[PDB]
């Protein structure tokens, strides 16, 4: 007899699926940013 | 279970207040949005080169109608009118009588392709796989009258597309 | 000889505008994961030509204008002023070397608001006129910061001569000493030319934005050419002002190549921005000017008057 | 250097420009508008053919009727058509616009938009696939390519 | 002479493009169609933004000579009067701001 064959998940299921929000952290601190910007002005002024 | 989408109170220390001031003045979160569109600029686009390339379809696709035959060339349609009864749009008009040899065959089989909703109910209802929706979807016309198919048009579609229609039926009839 | 020089400026300007329309559609296309024009000519290189022919043989619109003279004057003024803005630009040598070239460019751009006003008057539509008045209010508002920002930078240059900005930046781009002014300058040019996110004439908040509304207008192509000529010109002005290119008198072409690249990149950033952000509300872009840029621009003007004096860095007058 | 030759080549030029720069005014009435939006989306990118996505009715050259035209809506559709500058073309997209479709027998539905405006291309389907609509637009381009306005003028 | 020639050329071409933009469509000979003061009402706010632009624009006229003014020997006087003008420009904004002259809500 031919066994039943229909669309089914693979043995052991499927692998994990991500869904949570992921917005990574980037850049420098506020202090560091303002330091770089002020340093640029001073060098330009000089 | 539920979660809050927007119930975070910002911290009010120097480190944090100055981080938010930097964002306001230095436009950092706006620059971040520019980064995302720049990244897309360097991605391969998803555009296919139609009509040299075609969007993928499946054997179940519901396209232009066609009337089929048996391998001998005899028509499959025996004018039962199940298709005309089920048609949600009343797009099918059938008349029938005994053929010269006594066979039960249609003398009219019209589909108003501008009434049809391309639902595929007719091919589900047909007891002999006579009427099908084939794979053709490129049959737009310049006049309204060209979309009122009579039996001759539909038999011609069957003879035109049978090679593909038969293979698609072979691929899906075990799901039916 | 001079007549050749004029035509060697006007004609390339019109061609750059034509092909900027293609660059905009392809750059916006690829940022949107698609291609944009690539069928009409190889890589869409004939698309500007097909659009130009198509527009000029299209039927003129209805309804009829309220004022025939103002209907005709507005496009003449828009395009005439747009081309005029190019004549003092040093690339590296100007067509017309003006001692007050920067002031000339300010003065001519302040006249560009008349085409908006006249085309609204000639639209024969009450709602279209109200749309024109909102556009004028936006334009003149952001003219205030452009003038004050420009004055602040010239305090480091020392004169109103455009080619003196080249000498001023011989050692270093002015964007370093003046990046806060460059930021507000660049946004003001976007708002001045009614570019996204400041393109409310093409937005959804106008009384005439409804698709089924109609009013006297056109020709569309001539107004469109004038607008895009100003986009390029403003970005050329931005490069000269803040990203000065070194000029070698014996190899002027090197200036032109480097100067053209910077202008192109700045122009592409206009397209970049249009792809990236939603549109401002009218009251919000007024708030941006009057309650953010203007207070900071006045403060930075005070600073740039004082800074050369207190550092003993006043520039020369000649 | 006959006038027939020059008129023939001038026809090809203006026909080329008009079909290569087709600006549609999409009248998104119902479901079919979704497939029209999938024709603009990245996979098919109608803009790559010179067919700008969102164009104002003042500059549009073709009206696409994408959905059911009800009686209450018919006057507004005719008004837009009358305000389109020429040359103007109409594409009827989907069963509803073609002939009423599923709602053909309704008291409130116009049985085909060709009772209101002249239609150049009929695109069948409920809805036509985005590719089917694109096929229809390319069919309109070839119809424009066949135009002979100047040849007919020359023989008047 | 050159500037006059440039202005004449620029506005001459703009004029020719405009008239041919209006005549060239008449080659098609399209069919005939045969189918079509007072307040606006104007908001006071739109008038007041225009007036504010003007008064701010007049103060900018007084600030334009600043690049030349910095070449003077009397720098202390010049700097005092330059900052005085810009500050009064700021005071005009502050007065407008704190009397809700910059609002768009009715
Ligand atoms: C018309 C619609 C709008 C376009 C008008 C364009 C501006 C008008 C021309 C003014 C140019 C200018 O001031 O540049 C100074 C420029 C730049 O001044 P400069 O001092 O920088 O350089 C002059 C030369 N040096 C430095 C050696 C002394 O002046 C010149 O280049 C010389 C001008 C020569 C005399 C011009 C006579 C004709 C003036 C006609 C004015 C416009 C007529 C009215 C038109 C209708 C109403 C607008
Ligand atoms: C910036 C604007 C400046 C002003 C306007 C432009 C200058 C004035 C007009 C001359 C410009 C001509 C542009 C190039 C025309 C060629 C178009 C083309 O690429 O054909 C490809 C087309 C391509 O064929 P296709 O369009 O069917 O291809 C379908 C799409 N594919 C192939 C991908 C499936 O080839 C042709 O069939 C030729 C069409 C006719 C071209 C015009 C011929 C006459 C030209 C001389 C006219 C004389 C008067 C001139 C005044
Ligand atoms: C500066 C930049 C400008 C941008 C480029 C501008 C476009 C330039 C390239 C296109 C120029 C094409 C000019 C023709 C305009 C389109 C005309 C048209 O569509 O035909 C419709 C009309 C059709 O006329 P019709 O009368 O037969 O049909 C109209 C029917 N009714 C009235 C019902 C609407 O064509 C004409 O009227 C003739 C126009 C003359 C074109 C010049 C032909 C010269 C050759 C003939 C003489 C032979 C000896 C040589
Ligand atoms: C050239 C002449 C002078 C130019 C003007 C002078 C400077 C103007 C004033 C500057 C103001 C201060 C800005 C300081 C930002 C310094 C750059 C920076 O932040 O580097 C880090 C960041 C990427 O770092 P990342 O690894 O992603 O994350 C950090 C780890 N958590 O880096 C980035 O992702 C941002 C780098 C790109 C900045 C884009 C600028 C906008 C225009 C495009
Ligand atoms: C005490 C406070 C006084 C502040 C102003 C001091 C000043 O003007 O700086 C002088 C300095 C000139 O120094 P100089 O001798 O010419 O060259 C060697 C540089 N190390 O000038 C410079 O170094 C120019 C760079 C500084 C200019 C901006 C300083 C003020 C910025 C606000 C903080
Ligand atoms: C030593 C001392 C020397 C003294 C001088 C020291 C000065 C340095 C410290 C000051 C820094 C000044 C920064 C200058 C930028 C102006 C800041 C600004 O006004 O942005 C805030 C504005 C409003 O922000 P919002 O959060 O909406 O509301 C706040 C008001 N309630 O929001 C905005 O303006 C956002 C921008 C709106 C437009 C968005 C679309 C464009 C974004 C992309 C631009 C990319 C960068 C362009 C760079 C071009 C350079 C050529
Ligand atoms: C048509 C395309 C042409 C381009 C061709 C290809 C070349 C690409 C070059 C473009 C470079 C910009 C693209 C990359 C931008 C994306 C990087 C990024 O996302 O950084 C985000 C970073 C973090 O932001 P955030 O998460 O909010 O953190 C806040 C507290 N840390 O945010 C930041 O750190 C921002 C730091 C910079 C802030 C500077 C503020 C503006 C100052 C104006 C100076 C402009 C100087 C440059 C102008 C050009 C002259 C060279
Ligand atoms: C960029 C980093 C490399 C620096 C550079 O631009 O190359 C300099 C080169 C010759 O340098 P030059 O400017 O002539 O001499 C300076 C003295 N004034 O000049 C050149 O190589 C030609 C310019 C090519 C490099 C591009 C530099 C301009 C980049 C402008 C980016 C605009 C970004 C706008 C930001 C807002 C949008 C996010
Ligand atoms: C050492 C550290 C030095 C820096 C410390 C500075 C101290 C803080 C300065 C004052 C901060 C602002 C005060 C304030 O409360 O601002 C809030 C308010 C704006 O809020 P608003 O949006 O109008 O509220 C409406 C409801 N939605 O504000 C207002 O309503 C009115 C504010 C009007 C300000 C306009 C100023 C224009 C001029 C810009 C500054 C240029 C210099 C001016 C001259 C000063 C010279 C010293
Ligand atoms: C408040 C804080 C202001 C501080 C001002 C201190 C002035 C000190 C001074 O001595 O004045 C002269 C000053 C320095 O020069 P000095 O070395 O003292 O020379 C001596 C020769 N007798 O000279 C200088 O070097 C420059 C002087 C600049 C001072 C500008 C002060 C602003 C003036 C405009 C005020 C506007 C007020 C308008 C308000 C309107 C309200 C409706
Ligand atoms: C020698 C050169 C001769 C001049 C040639 C001029 C060719 C002009 C080609 C334009 C190509 C299409 O370019 C595109 O047009 C449409 C207008 O329909 C613009 O569309 C924009 O303006 C219209 C209103 O005017 C809005 O309804 C629309 O929402 C907005 O996006 C796009 O911002 C622009 O990217
Ligand atoms: S597909 Fe549906 S609507 Fe069309 S003829 Fe068959 S049953 Fe009728
Ligand atoms: S097509 Fe099939 S269902 Fe319809 S009348 Fe013929 S045999 Fe019956
Ligand atoms: S034809 Fe079909 S898909 Fe299109 S509007 Fe009508 S019911 Fe919807």
UniProtKB/Swiss-Prot annotation, chain A:
Annotated TM spans: 28-46
UniProt protein name: NADH dehydrogenase [ubiquinone] 1 alpha subcomplex subunit 13
Residues of the full protein shown: 3 to 48 of 144
Subunit structure, interactors included: Complex I is composed of 45 different subunits. Interacts with CARD15, but not with CARD4. Interacts with STAT3, but not with STAT1, STAT2 and STAT5A. Interacts with OLFM4.
Compartment(s) where it occurs, according to its Swiss-Prot or TrEMBL record: Mitochondrion inner membrane; Nucleus
Family: Belongs to the complex I NDUFA13 subunit family.
Naturally occurring in which organism (per UniProt): Bos taurus
Role description: Accessory subunit of the mitochondrial membrane respiratory chain NADH dehydrogenase (Complex I), that is believed not to be involved in catalysis. Complex I functions in the transfer of electrons from NADH to the respiratory chain. The immediate electron acceptor for the enzyme is believed to be ubiquinone. Involved in the interferon/all-trans-retinoic acid (IFN/RA) induced cell death. This apoptotic activity is inhibited by interaction with viral IRF1. Prevents the transactivation of STAT3 target genes.
Gene coding for it: NDUFA13
Lineage, top ranks: Eukaryota, Metazoa, Chordata, Craniata, Vertebrata
UniProtKB/Swiss-Prot annotation, chain B:
Domain 4Fe-4S ferredoxin-type: residue ranges: 68-97, 107-136
Record localization: Mitochondrion inner membrane
Keyword field contains Flavoprotein: no
Top-rank EC class of the record's enzyme: translocase
An example Gene Ontology biological process: mitochondrial respiratory chain complex I assembly
EC number assigned by the record: 7.1.1.2
CC per GO annotation: mitochondrial inner membrane; respiratory chain complex I
Molecular functions (GO terms): 4 iron, 4 sulfur cluster binding; metal ion binding; NADH dehydrogenase (ubiquinone) activity
Free-text comment on the cofactor: Binds 2 [4Fe-4S] clusters per subunit.
Cofactor requirements of the protein: [4Fe-4S] cluster
Mode of membrane association: Peripheral membrane protein
UniProtKB keywords: 4Fe-4S, Electron transport, Iron, Iron-sulfur, Membrane, Metal-binding, Mitochondrion, Mitochondrion inner membrane, NAD, Oxidoreductase, Repeat, Respiratory chain, Transit peptide, Translocase, Transport, Ubiquinone
Binding site for [4Fe-4S] cluster 1: 77, 80, 83, 126
Catalysis: reaction(s): a ubiquinone + NADH + 5 H(+)(in) = a ubiquinol + NAD(+) + 4 H(+)(out)
Keyword Cell inner membrane recorded: no
Domain of life: Eukaryota
Residues the entry annotates as binding [4Fe-4S] cluster 2: 87, 116, 119, 122
Function: Core subunit of the mitochondrial membrane respiratory chain NADH dehydrogenase (Complex I) which catalyzes electron transfer from NADH through the respiratory chain, using ubiquinone as an electron acceptor. Essential for the catalytic activity and assembly of complex I.
Subunit structure, interactors included: Core subunit of respiratory chain NADH dehydrogenase (Complex I) which is composed of 45 different subunits. This is a component of the iron-sulfur (IP) fragment of the enzyme. Interacts with RAB5IF.
Family in the record: Belongs to the complex I 23 kDa subunit family.
From Swiss-Prot, chain C:
Any one GO biological process: mitochondrial respiratory chain complex I assembly
Keyword Transport included in the entry's annotation: yes
Keywords on record: Electron transport, Formylation, Membrane, Mitochondrion, Mitochondrion inner membrane, NAD, Respiratory chain, Translocase, Transmembrane, Transmembrane helix, Transport, Ubiquinone
Subcellular location: Mitochondrion inner membrane
Transmembrane parts of this sequence: 2-22, 70-90, 100-120, 146-166, 172-192, 222-242, 253-273, 294-314
Membrane topology, from the record: Multi-pass membrane protein
Pfam annotation, one family: NADHdh
Predominant subcellular localization, coarse grouping: mitochondrion
Identification of the protein by name: NADH-ubiquinone oxidoreductase chain 1
Annotated source species: Bos taurus
UniProtKB/Swiss-Prot annotation, chain D:
Disulfide bonds: none
Span covered, complete protein: 61 to 216 of 216
Function text: Core subunit of the mitochondrial membrane respiratory chain NADH dehydrogenase (Complex I) which catalyzes electron transfer from NADH through the respiratory chain, using ubiquinone as an electron acceptor. Essential for the catalytic activity of complex I.
Name of protein: NADH dehydrogenase [ubiquinone] iron-sulfur protein 7, mitochondrial
GO molecular function, one term: NADH dehydrogenase (ubiquinone) activity
Organism: Bos taurus
GO biological process annotation, one example: mitochondrial electron transport, NADH to ubiquinone
Phylogenetic placement of the source organism: Eukaryota, Metazoa, Chordata, Craniata, Vertebrata
Post-translational modification comment from the UniProt entry: Hydroxylated ar Arg-54 by NDUFAF5 early in the pathway of assembly of complex I, before the formation of the juncture between peripheral and membrane arms.
Taxonomic superkingdom: Eukaryota
A single cellular component GO annotation: respiratory chain complex I
Cofactor(s) for this UniProt protein: [4Fe-4S] cluster
Enzyme's top EC category: translocase
Subcellular location: Mitochondrion inner membrane
Keyword annotations from UniProtKB, A to Z: 4Fe-4S, Electron transport, Hydroxylation, Iron, Iron-sulfur, Membrane, Metal-binding, Mitochondrion, Mitochondrion inner membrane, NAD, Oxidoreductase, Respiratory chain, Transit peptide, Translocase, Transport, Ubiquinone
Family under the similarity heading: Belongs to the complex I 20 kDa subunit family.
Modified residues (Hydroxyarginine): 54
Catalytic activity: a ubiquinone + NADH + 5 H(+)(in) = a ubiquinol + NAD(+) + 4 H(+)(out)
